Design a protein around this nucleic acid. Structure first.
Ligand SMILES: [Mg+2]
Ligand SMILES: [Zn+2]
Lengths: 60, 217, 344, 181, 79, 56, 41, 55, 137, 143, 192, 42
RNA sequence: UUGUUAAAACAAAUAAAAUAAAGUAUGAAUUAAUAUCAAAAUUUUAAUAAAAAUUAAAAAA
RNA sequence: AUAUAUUUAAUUUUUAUAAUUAAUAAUAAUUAAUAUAAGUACGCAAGGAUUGAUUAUUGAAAAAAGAAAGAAGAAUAUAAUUUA
């Protein structure tokens, strides 16, 4: 790792930067409420999942 | 009348951790002082010659150099002055050869700072807090003088030079950019040597030689 | 400050009775030459001057008779002894903390502060060091994050053995004045700091590696130019200098981050002396786990930090009382919040 | 910055163990929060490589891979063992979607529960071989499942050397030659 | 909750004060409402025929030890 | 991991076999003089994509 | 802790630190036993 | 402006640390206690013994 | 090596040797059996009035080696309860607050009826430093 | 002339992510949340995203002379349990004025109360469509 | 209503701590929890015989396995307990190696008071210390049985859990002693 | 042909710059060395 | 961001995120007066002067 | 609208530990307006003071000693969350 040494980052802790005060993905829970998630006309995944979720919630 | 908070698992007599003691005010100052005998320290130094054992014994005797006696001090200095020679370099312990820049430079092990701390502790013990031990015992005077001559203290460049054809300047050189900060300009034995020469000049002002009358030809 | 030439230090400018050295005993008259021949032809050797005698006598009488009226004039003699905390001379060593996490708090006025919590695991005064015994050249090394023996390198475990202090992970040196010492092995409780206190912190920001000149300096990196060449302001003659080389300091692409960053004068928000936590309303750039170092701010706005109007520090270092037990004491009981402050 | 895989469909009464991942889709990256991305031609190519690799791993119980493919393969094998321990119909549908061979899907779902009933995590095992690939001078790693001889269709097999032919069954230790597949 | 190791009186008071936020929670609810109750944690209780908060509270020390160490439920002690 | 290292490994193997055949012991063998001097040479031209000649 | 050697500094057999004055309040240590010749070489 | 470089400028590269650590450097090796082969610590063999226990 | 760099590189060991020679005179006293710390003459002339008729105070502080050794060895006393409990003030209160309102004058707009003990606006603005006699805040 | 950007100083490069285990950081978060609850800056909440999403809420921002009241519909809740993080996404419409606020819990000068933990996804969808139509109309009138 | 909401919050805040119990002496062994599973039942009988209480009074809580750590740390409650303590050996420069990795708490009847609990804890601690010393000196009594056949080698007396906190002010309103007594009487009636 | 190595000492180099009073070069004599005192008053 | 149309769509273009384009072996060609080439500033001699002189001191990859 | 030399930006990989020495005055010419300073001197009236503190940018400035062919992660941010 001497040729890459001047460019690549170097760390002793192994690259562990985890803040237990910030908001995590499991705490956010579901991103479909975000505007991008339900108006992302460019992702079949986003469109299909948000449609399925809204239909399931309305049915329930 | 108190009871402990947990059970103490049994242990053999040889595997105990005796020999040290915490300071008086433990809940505020947890300094650890050694109470081992100088004979034990010398036996460890002479039986286990590993560098870690050497530095541990040196630190123990440097912490115990305060309340010991003249005979124990002479014994300690005679046991310490064994691996040193006058022909070779005095206090050189160069182990690592770093050639990061153009020409290489040598980094020693912990034995050099161990010896430096020992000399400093001896200076503090025989100069500042007990200024009469040298004038009282001329044997300890000559012993510490011969030890300080055997380890080349007044030329710390020979501590860091590896080949006599290219002497080192690790101690006498220093630049404000940040090079040679901890290693340059070490006041190792200057104060002790000044105290000794002042003791030898005390005769001219005292009109009668105390040290020179106590010592032998 | 007010300029005061040394030549203006004559007795006609002194606010108190000017006292000449005069050997062992202070006198009110210049030292008369013992050799009479040394007397200069116009030098008027004064042995008794009724003016100065009366002035000094009345001054001493008033000082000894009305202590309440002349209390401020008592600093002319019996100065504060050495060892007590001084407002302009006593600086104390800081501590070594670990950036724990981030949260947000709110003051009573309604302002939101995005704070970061640092953790001070085991602060212990490890070493003292002075170079050749000069003035103001002494400092105290404090160690932190006690570790086992199998962790550190051999050459640093050797130093910790030589010191006798329990082997710490990190060790930072603070330059202090000799009257602020603390014995080797002294535990430093976090209550050493106060909540309404300004602190200067030093850490290492995160590492981004080699980054472009745009990302390094933002908009500043795109345009970099400096010309110290002479140029004609008026068309009278012809003469200039060619900028041959590139001047040092040219903003280019290179290493970004991973440097020693120091914030100066951030106020403390809250202190938890059960888990050894300190909260600062400033969001830092460093990662989680960077050993920050906290030190006391000297002065701000021409005003010293430690004074009677703001408060007295825990000089030299805070020592808890005996009957206090942090184990029995709860977490909610160990909370010290700073007085309110508005910044908008 | 946001992962659409968090948008949950057909939610169960109980929250999933991961609750944020696929968990087969790994979102390869270089920060420690993600998996090491082995060099490919596109993220789709990377996913296809991972799919074929985990399929072959499930098929032949071992895989020798070079470069950063070994940690990715190990974590994906761990996720597959987690799916097998779950044993739900949706989990099986997802594994059949992600894998190339439904026969290997069935083999995994049949053999892995009995195999890893008595284990919590770190089911696979990666061993860095001292021998590097000749064409690239890249390190190689042997990734295999740990519980081979306690309960599995493979048992008492020798992996120190390959068979006489690559279409013959693998070597079998003489101690357990009586077992049948 | 991320207690870890041993449940403390702080976590006890947390659960007590959060019990107010749910008005519909009855002692007969499904075991999934409890905290740290994952799929693998609750399926073992279903195997042992534990469908109720009352039952999972009446669970014995040896039984929860078996559920944690032999079955593989991580936070069964917290549950 | 160097082609030169592989070639000199082959050379060391052959030299050890020859020394054994001559009658020298195996444990006390040491390289005394290893050198290389330029030898033969070949020149190869080749066409590339869209018709460019390259020399090697 | 396969890589971790008890008492040695960073798992190095030639840097024995056990049964010395290394004050360590919270962490334990192992008593001393003289290493063999085949262990060091 | 490019010109032929004297032999001294061709030997300046070996003074830097980049050339020394790349080409000319020895290995720390020992004998695999199960294979009796030279082995670097950290990289193991394919054999069943070397995978279960690390030699 | 610049001119100043070479000058300092060749003079710094000489400066240290000169300081050692200076401390040798101090060690002369402890050598004769009478260990005596260095004495410094306390200067009573440190409060001056400048040319522009304003007060200047010089600060001279001394270091005691015995007190240094005492602070090195003996632990400091227990910190004061009020000192560690009462937080430090954030804003520095002015030397003279302008209240602008006093209940003593019957007509508050009467400028001649306000008591003299209340500080003025001129003091409120100019008094940013302590008075001539008192030096510390 | 020359300067250095990186520092290999041991005290700066050493990390404590391995020793972060002895600090009960989650317990500190819960203690801060409980202190806020006992002071009254926030009130504990236990709802899920789909349950709270679509429930009317009233928020009073205290302000002399008149505290400003605002009745809106909860569009998104960032946290399911009480914490110092919190976060709520409300949408309120005045007379010909729509607005989307992100209310953080724990502000003493801000008292927000959801009128019912139960929510109507139909009304949520209605409010979402109204907000999206207003946003699109604003963008179209701008550009 | 906000008033009644703060009232029910104050009620649940001043409510007595349910499901909380103080342990007498936390026992610890070096074997694994999966091995202690099969012997945990006889531990109750042997502890009853050690405490000289009627059979069936000792209750063992959930078995815990202190998480093994390559980098030891003392402050964690999941840390493996050490055979030595600072109060035991102040003048020792380090601690003795790990003694316990599988732990279990021991409870008496709920009617017994804290003085009886701490007395029984001290008795158990002393008896186990004597038993371990006799084991070391040698290589019938319940202590010797627990030490030999069950592999128990650690006992701890846990400090009182002070993480609990009194509610001096709920919802921004101070708690009066009359209201606290009313809530306490209500909870006592509900328990009755 | 004489040759001075390019790898010379430097002020940033840790080895540092030497003292000619301490050096032992060929062209540096130390036997015939006398000490003179020079007062610069005026 | 701009422009066109209508009461959102299209086309342009860059600056943030994301994707790729090796640390492996194979290996040319432009160029080549040259001292182990003169870091810089000042002054000057027949046109950039890297030609000369005076200060000054410019490490290696 | 050609790969060059000088000059610059970096790097030479945990170094327990900054700088009494190159940045030879100053990061603004040690500021500095501002509500409150003042419905007030000065002005017949109209109108109109000098002025420095809390509101701001004011800490001005370089972290050079230890054994080196994996990913500085055994990688899904836990220094092994039980593990056959
Ligand atoms: Mg290094
Ligand atoms: Zn092998």
């Amino acid at each position: 790792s001497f040729k890459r040494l001047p460019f690549g980052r170097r760390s002793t802790s192994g690259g562990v930067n985890f803040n237990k005060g910030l908001l995590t993905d499991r705490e956010r829970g579901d991103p479909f409420t975000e505007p991008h998630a339900y108006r992302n006309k460019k992702s079949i995944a986003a469109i299909s999942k948000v449609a399925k979720k809204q239909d399931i919630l309305l049915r329930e | 009348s108190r009871f402990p908070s947990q059970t103490m698992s049994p242990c053999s007599h040889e595997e105990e951790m005796r020999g040290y003691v915490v300071s008086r005010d433990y809940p505020l100052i947890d300094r650890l002082h050694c109470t081992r005998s100088i004979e034990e320290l010398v036996a460890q130094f002479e039986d286990r010659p590993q560098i870690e054992s050497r530095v541990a014994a040196l630190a123990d005797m440097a912490s115990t150099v305060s309340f010991r006696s003249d005979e124990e001090l002479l014994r300690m200095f005679t046991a310490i002055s064994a691996p040193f020679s006058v022909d070779g370099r005095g206090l050189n312990f160069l182990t690592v050869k770093v050639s990061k820049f153009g020409r290489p430079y040598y980094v020693p092990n912990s034995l050099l700072p161990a010896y430096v701390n020992l000399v400093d502790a001896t200076t503090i013990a025989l100069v500042r807090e007990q200024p009469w031990r040298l004038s009282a015992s001329p044997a300890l005077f000559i012993q510490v003088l011969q030890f300080m001559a055997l380890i080349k203290v007044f030329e710390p460049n020979k501590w860091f030079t590896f080949s006599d054809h290219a002497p080192s300047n690790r101690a006498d050189y220093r630049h404000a950019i940040g090079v040679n900060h901890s290693t340059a300009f070490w006041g190792t034995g200057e104060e002790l040597y000044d105290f000794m020469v002042e003791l030898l000049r005390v005769e001219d002002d005292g009109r009668i030689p105390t040290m020179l009358d106590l010592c032998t030809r | 400050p007010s300029l005061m030439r040394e030549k203006d230090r004559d007795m006609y400018h002194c606010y108190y009775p000017y006292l000449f050295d005069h050997g062992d005993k202070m006198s009110l008259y210049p030292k008369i030459p013992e050799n009479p021949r040394e007397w200069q032809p116009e030098q008027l050797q004064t042995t008794y001057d009724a003016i100065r005698e009366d002035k000094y006598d009345a001054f001493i009488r008033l000082r000894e008779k009305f202590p309440e009226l002349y209390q401020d004039t008592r600093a002319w003699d019996n100065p504060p002894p050495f060892g007590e905390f001084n407002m302009f001379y006593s600086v104390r060593f800081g501590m070594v903390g670990v950036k724990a996490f981030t949260c947000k708090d709110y003051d009573e006025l309604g302002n939101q502060f995005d704070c970061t919590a640092f953790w001070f695991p085991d602060n212990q005064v490890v070493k003292h060091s002075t170079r050749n015994g000069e003035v103001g050249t002494d400092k105290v090394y404090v160690g932190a994050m006690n570790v086992p023996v199998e962790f550190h390198k051999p050459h640093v475990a050797a130093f910790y053995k030589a010191a006798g202090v329990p082997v710490k992970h990190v060790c930072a040196g603070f330059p202090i004045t000799p009257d602020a010492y603390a014995p080797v092995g002294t535990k430093l409780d976090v209550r050493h700091f106060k909540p309404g206190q300004e602190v200067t912190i030093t850490f290492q920001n995160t590492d981004y590696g080699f980054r472009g000149v745009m990302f390094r300096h933002g908009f500043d990196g795109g345009y970099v130019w400096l010309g110290d060449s002479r140029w004609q302001r008026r068309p009278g003659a012809m003469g200039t200098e060619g900028q041959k080389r590139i001047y040092p300091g040219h903003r280019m692409a290179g290493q970004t981050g991973a440097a020693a960053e120091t914030y100066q004068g951030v106020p403390v928000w809250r202190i938890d002396y059960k888990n050894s936590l300190i909260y600062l309303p400033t969001l830092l750039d460093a990662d989680v786990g960077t050993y920050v170092r906290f030190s006391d701010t000297i002065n701000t706005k021409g005003l010293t930090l430690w004074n009677e109007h703001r408060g007295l520090p825990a000089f030299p270092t805070f020592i808890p009382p005996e009957d206090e037990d942090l184990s029995k004491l709860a977490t909610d009981e160990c909370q010290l919040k700073s007085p309110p402050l508005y910044m908008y | 910055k946001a992962r659409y895989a968090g948008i949950d469909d057909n939610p169960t009464i109980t929250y999933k163990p991961w609750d944020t991942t696929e968990p087969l889709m790994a979102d390869y990256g270089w920060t420690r929060g993600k998996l090491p991305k082995f060099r490919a031609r596109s993220p789709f190519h990377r996913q296809q490589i991972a799919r074929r690799m985990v399929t072959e791993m499930i098929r032949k119980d071992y895989c020798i891979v070079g470069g950063a493919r070994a940690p990715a393969l190990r974590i994906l094998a761990d996720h597959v063992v987690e799916l097998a321990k779950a044993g739900d119909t949706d989990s099986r549908q997802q594994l059949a979607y992600f894998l190339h061979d439904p026969l290997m899907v069935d083999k995994a779902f049949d053999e892995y529960p009995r195999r890893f009933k008595d284990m919590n995590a770190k089911y696979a095992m990666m061993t860095r071989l001292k021998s590097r690939r000749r064409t690239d001078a890249v390190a190689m790693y042997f990734v295999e499942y740990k519980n081979r001889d306690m309960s599995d269709n493979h048992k008492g097999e020798d992996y120190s050397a390959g068979p006489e032919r690559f279409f013959l069954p693998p070597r079998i230790v003489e101690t357990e030659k009586g077992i049948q597949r | 909750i991320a207690t870890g190791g041993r449940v403390t009186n702080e976590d006890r008071r947390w659960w007590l004060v959060h019990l107010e936020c749910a008005p519909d929670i009855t002692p007969g609810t499904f075991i999934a409402w409890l905290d740290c109750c994952g799929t693998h944690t609750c399926k073992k209780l279903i195997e042992r025929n534990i469908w109720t908060i009352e039952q999972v509270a009446a669970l014995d020390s040896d039984q929860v030890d078996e559920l944690k160490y032999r079955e593989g439920c991580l936070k069964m002690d917290v549950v | 991991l160097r082609k030169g290292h592989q070639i000199v490994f082959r050379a060391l193997e052959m030299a050890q076999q020859g020394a054994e055949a001559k009658g020298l012991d195996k444990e006390h063998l040491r390289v005394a003089h290893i050198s290389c001097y330029p030898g033969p040479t070949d020149k190869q031209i080749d066409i590339r994509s869209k018709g460019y000649y390259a020399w090697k | 802790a396969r890589n971790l050697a008890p008492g040695f500094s960073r798992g190095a057999l030639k840097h024995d630190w056990r049964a010395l004055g290394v004050y360590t309040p919270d962490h334990p240590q192992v008593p001393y036993h003289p290493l063999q010749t085949w262990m060091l070489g | 402006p490019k010109r032929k470089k004297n032999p001294m400028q061709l030997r300046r590269k070996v003074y830097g640390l980049h050339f020394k650590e790349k080409y000319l450097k020895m290995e720390e090796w020992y004998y695999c206690p199960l294979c009796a082969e030279p082995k670097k610590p950290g990289e193991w063999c394919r054999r069943e013994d070397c995978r279960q226990i690390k030699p | 090596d610049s001119f100043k760099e070479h000058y300092h590189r060749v003079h710094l060991p000489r400066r240290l040797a000169l300081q050692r020679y200076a401390r040798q005179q101090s060690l002369r006293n402890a050598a004769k059996g009478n260990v005596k710390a260095e004495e410094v003459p306390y200067k009573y002339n440190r409060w001056w009035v400048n040319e522009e008729h304003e007060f200047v105070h010089q600060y001279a502080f001394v270091e005691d080696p015995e007190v240094t050794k005492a602070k090195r060895e003996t632990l400091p006393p227990v910190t004061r309860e009020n000192i560690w409990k009462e937080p430090q003030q954030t804003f520095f209160l002015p030397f003279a607050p302008y209240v602008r309102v006093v209940d003593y004058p019957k007509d508050p707009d009467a400028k001649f009826l306000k008591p003299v003990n209340i500080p003025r606006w001129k003091d409120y603005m100019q008094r940013t430093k302590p008075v001539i006699p008192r030096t510390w805040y | 002339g020359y300067t250095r950007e990186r520092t290999n100083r041991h005290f700066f490069v050493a990390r404590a992510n391995a020793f972060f285990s002895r600090l009960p950081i989650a317990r500190v978060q819960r203690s801060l949340a409980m202190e806020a609850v006992r002071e009254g800056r926030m009130r504990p909440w236990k709802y899920t995203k789909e349950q709270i999403l679509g429930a009317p809420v009233t928020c009073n921002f205290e302000y002399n002379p008149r505290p400003v009241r605002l009745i809106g519909t909860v569009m998104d809740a960032h946290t399911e349990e009480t914490s110092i993080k919190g976060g709520l996404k409300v949408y309120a419409r005045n007379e010909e004025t729509n607005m989307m606020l992100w209310i953080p819990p724990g502000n003493p000068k801000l008292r927000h109360e959801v009128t019912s933990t139960k929510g109507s996804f139909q009304h949520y969808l209605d409010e979402r469509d109204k907000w999206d139509e207003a946003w699109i109309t604003g963008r179209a009138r701008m550009k | 209503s906000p008033g009644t909401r703060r009232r029910v919050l104050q009620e649940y805040a001043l409510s007595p701590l349910f499901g909380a119990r103080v342990p007498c002496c936390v026992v610890g062994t070096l074997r694994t929890a999966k091995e202690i599973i099969v012997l945990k039942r006889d531990i109750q009988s042997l502890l009853c015989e050690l405490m000289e209480l009627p059979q069936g009074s000792v209750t063992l809580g959930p078995l815990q396995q202190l998480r093994e750590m390559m980098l030891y740390r003392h402050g964690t409650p999941l840390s493996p307990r050490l055979g030595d303590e600072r109060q035991l050996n102040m003048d020792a420069y380090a601690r003795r190696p790990i003694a316990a990795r599988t732990m279990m708490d021991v409870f008496l009847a709920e009617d017994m008071s804290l003085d009886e609990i701490v007395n029984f804890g001290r008795l158990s601690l002393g008896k186990l210390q004597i038993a371990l010393n006799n084991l070391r000196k040698e290589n019938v009594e319940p202590a010797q049985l627990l030490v030999d056949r069950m592999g128990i080698s650690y006992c701890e007396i846990p400090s009182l859990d002070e993480s609990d906190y009194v509610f001096a002010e709920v919802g921004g309103v101070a708690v009066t002693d009359e209201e606290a007594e009313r809530v306490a009487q209500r909870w006592a009636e509900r328990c009755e | 042909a004489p040759f001075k190595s390019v790898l010379r000492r430097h002020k940033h180099h840790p080895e540092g710059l030497p003292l000619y009073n301490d050096m032992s070069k060929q062209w540096l004599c130390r036997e015939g060395e006398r000490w003179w005192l020079l007062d610069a008053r005026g």
